[PDB]
């Protein structure tokens, strides 16, 4: 009923959208992994009379449900998708997207890691993102590679029209007391990568984490704090 939806509010398989700004939504779904249930976010950005999708809904059936929810709530076609790192909460569902006419994209680093891991593989490679601090335009967003953080390949996404910063899994929500799933993380580089985000997007008004509640710029500093403390 208007609040940002949370893990116990979304059955696995269902997707909800949340309006972030004009022409910007997050998508929220939940998924089981190693016997626990987790929420995760993605982004939807209006791209004229089309939509740009950022990240899958973490699984094939969740991603099919995402497409259906988009049709119900928005009614514009998803034509392109970008996955912001190689984990299943970002690429799981790419095959569903690819069969629904969506052109799927990721950095070459993400594509190589997804392939090596046995995850679904976006079709198209996003060049121009291989060095930390790199940025490229992609429809109505800017893609930014901040450096290694949650993963070595993690990208963040900025929506300049709305000053929305989608941090993906390099950014945690304010209630986070732990650094999430750090299996593929670089805890030493993560604060430096967050500092790069902070420097590059000082006008961000909404910051969306990969999992959990959006907030403001403080999510960035909080993330750096939690990651440093976890490493400690």
Q: Are 45 and 139 in contact (CB under 8 A)?
A: yes
Helices in 74-138 by DSSP H: which ranges? 88-91, 94-99, 108-117
By rule CB under 5 A, what count of residues binds Zn ion? 4
Q: Is 218 annotated as a binding residue?
A: no
Q: Are 49 and 76 in contact (CB under 8 A)?
A: yes
153 catalytic residue (yes or no): no
- Shortest distance in whole angstroms from residue 151 CB to Zn ion: 6
89 catalytic residue (yes or no): yes
The strand order across the sheet containing 164-168 reads 135-138, 141-144, 156-159, 164-168, 206-209
Token pair of 225 as six digits:
């704090």
Among residues 55, 88, 89, 153, which one is catalytic? 89
Among residues 27, 85, 172, 222, which one is catalytic? 85
Q: Does 87 bind Zn ion (CB under 5 A)?
A: yes
Q: Which does 116 bind (CB under 5 to 8 A by kind): Zn ion, ligand YSR, none?
A: none
Among 88, 89, 120, 153, the residue binding Zn ion under the rule CB under 5 A is 89
Token pair of 40 as six digits:
């995760």
Helices in 108-183 by DSSP H: which ranges? 108-117
Nearest 5°: the CA angle 39, 138, 163 is 65
Residue numbers at the binding site for ligand YSR (CB under 6 A): 33, 38, 87-89, 150, 169, 178, 180-181, 183-184, 210-212
Q: Which does 222 bind (CB under 5 to 8 A by kind): Zn ion, ligand YSR, none?
A: none
- Residue number of the CB closest to ligand YSR reads 180
Q: Given the complex with ligand YSR, which of 25 and 58 has the nearer CB atom?
A: 58
Token pair of 49 as six digits:
């009379």
Q: Which does 111 bind (CB under 5 to 8 A by kind): ligand YSR, Zn ion, none?
A: none
Q: Given the complex with ligand YSR, which of 22 and 34 has the nearer CB atom?
A: 34
CA terminus-to-terminus distance, the chain = 40
Among residues 27, 41, 55, 87, which one is catalytic? 87
| Residue of 44, 59, 75 whose CA lies nearest to 13 | 59
List all residues 6 or more positions away from 11 whose beta carbon is below 8 Å from its beta carbon: 30
124 catalytic residue (yes or no): no
Binding-site annotation: residue ranges for Zn(2+): 85, 87, 89, 125, 127, 150, 169, 211
Task: Name the site residues for Zn ion (rule: CB under 5 A).
Answer: 87, 89, 169, 210
Q: What are the residue numbers of the active site?
A: 85, 87, 89, 150, 181
Binding-site annotation: residue ranges: 85, 87, 89, 125, 127, 150, 169, 211
């Amino acid at each position: 009923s208007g609040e940002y939806p949370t893990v116990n509010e979304i059955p696995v398989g269902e997707v909800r959208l949340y309006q972030i700004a004009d022409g910007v939504w997050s998508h929220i779904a939940t998924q089981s992994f190693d016997g626990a249930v987790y929420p995760s976010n993605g982004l939807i950005v209006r791209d004229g009379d089309e939509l740009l999708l950022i990240d899958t809904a973490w699984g094939a059936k969740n991603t099919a449900a995402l497409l259906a929810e988009i049709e119900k709530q928005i009614g514009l076609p998803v034509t392109r998708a970008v996955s912001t790192h190689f984990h299943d909460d970002r690429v799981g569902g790419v095959d569903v997207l690819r069969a629904a006419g969506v052109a799927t994209y990721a950095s070459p680093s993400t594509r190589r890691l997804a392939e090596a891991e046995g995850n679904e593989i976006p079709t198209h490679s996003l060049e121009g993102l291989s060095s930390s601090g790199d940025a490229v335009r992609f429809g109505p967003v800017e893609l930014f590679y901040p450096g290694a953080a949650h993963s070595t390949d993690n990208l963040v996404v900025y929506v300049p029209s709305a000053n929305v910063l989608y941090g993906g899994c390099a950014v945690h929500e304010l209630s986070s007391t732990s650094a999430g799933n750090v299996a593929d993380a670089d805890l030493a580089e993560w604060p430096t990568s967050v500092e790069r985000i902070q420097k590059h997007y000082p006008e961000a008004e909404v910051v969306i984490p990969g999992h959990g509640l959006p907030g403001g710029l403080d999510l960035l500093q909080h993330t750096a704090n939690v990651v440093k403390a976890h490493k400690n």
